Design an enzyme around this catalytic site. Structure first.
Site: not given
Ligand SMILES: COC(=O)c1cc(NC(=O)c2cccc(O)c2C)c2cc(C(=N)N)ccc2c1
Length: 238
Positions: A44, A93, A160-163, A186, A188-189
């Site tokens: 992604h 992913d 259980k945390r993501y129903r 940020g 991610s990956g």
């Molecule tokens: C590019 O990857 C993502 O969009 C994206 C969006 C997320 N989750 C959010 O809810 C979020 C966080 C910050 C800004 C934002 O706009 C959002 C929707 C993410 C949450 C985690 C984690 N908690 N382990 C890790 C990577 C994520 C990558």
């Protein structure tokens, strides 16, 4: 990374920062060196990306400030996305980046070993997530690579945390019931390194989560061990 601290230079030699040059250069995602010409990252991370030409992989980086117009990088020859991937939250992913040139290993940049199938019974109690991601929900890319020690949670616990979601065995979660430490946008990956018996293993790939570091909301990662066959098949020459 939320609730973490600055890493020591060279502490995570397999961690790379993937940049896009469009419209102007910026950090896009984290990634892990797993081979001389291979970076393992999240699928992604290439949303809206129709060419590897705008990608740049920087290795042996601690501070984003080290990256300037005259800093060397690895071009990306090919982006390989799992053909079953639709979206982070649905699994699969995972993506491979075939570099245009080979990475010369050194103390500042070396590969991280992949998990062994015979290690699915192993209990990693020394896992860390790293990255230049947000330190909070609404934030920005960080200069210094951050690190945070986070415990793995069972899939049943995670589900259980993501129903409203489907946590499959191809996913693995990590977090504190009370939150406080977690990966974020940020990151991610990013790699979810676990050290078992003095050997670091790439257990997961930062994929998603509801917000960041919220209580009862574990980070969700790609369960790498479930893709060793895929990785082998895709990184061959055949
Ligand atoms: C590019 O990857 C993502 O969009 C994206 C969006 C997320 N989750 C959010 O809810 C979020 C966080 C910050 C800004 C934002 O706009 C959002 C929707 C993410 C949450 C985690 C984690 N908690 N382990 C890790 C990577 C994520 C990558």
């Amino acid at each position: 990374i939320v609730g973490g601290t600055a890493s020591v230079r060279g502490e995570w030699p397999w961690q790379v920062t993937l940049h896009t040059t469009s419209p102007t250069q910026r950090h896009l995602c984290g990634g892990s060196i797993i081979g001389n010409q291979w970076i393992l990252t999240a699928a992604h991370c290439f949303y809206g990306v129709e060419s590897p030409k705008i990608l740049r992989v920087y290795s042996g980086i601690l501070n984003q400030a080290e990256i300037a117009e005259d800093t060397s990088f690895f071009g990306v020859q090919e982006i390989i996305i799992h053909d079953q991937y639709k979206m982070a939250e649905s699994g699969y992913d995972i993506a491979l980046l075939k570099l245009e040139t080979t990475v010369n290993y050194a103390d500042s940049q070396r590969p991280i070993s992949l998990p062994s199938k015979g290690d699915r019974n192993v209990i990693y109690t020394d896992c860390w997530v790293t990255g230049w991601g947000y330190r909070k929900l609404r934030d920005k890319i960080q200069n210094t690579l951050q690190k945070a020690k986070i415990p793995l949670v069972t899939n049943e616990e995670c589900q259980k945390r993501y129903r409203g979601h489907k946590i499959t065995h191809k996913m693995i979660c990590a977090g504190y019931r009370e939150g406080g430490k977690d990966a974020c946008k940020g990151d991610s990956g990013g790699p979810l390194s676990c050290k078992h018996n003095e050997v670091w293993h790439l257990v997961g790939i930062t994929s998603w989560g509801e917000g960041c570091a919220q209580r009862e909301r574990p980070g969700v990662y790609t369960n790498v061990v479930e893709y060793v066959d895929w990785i082998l098949e895709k990184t061959q020459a055949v």
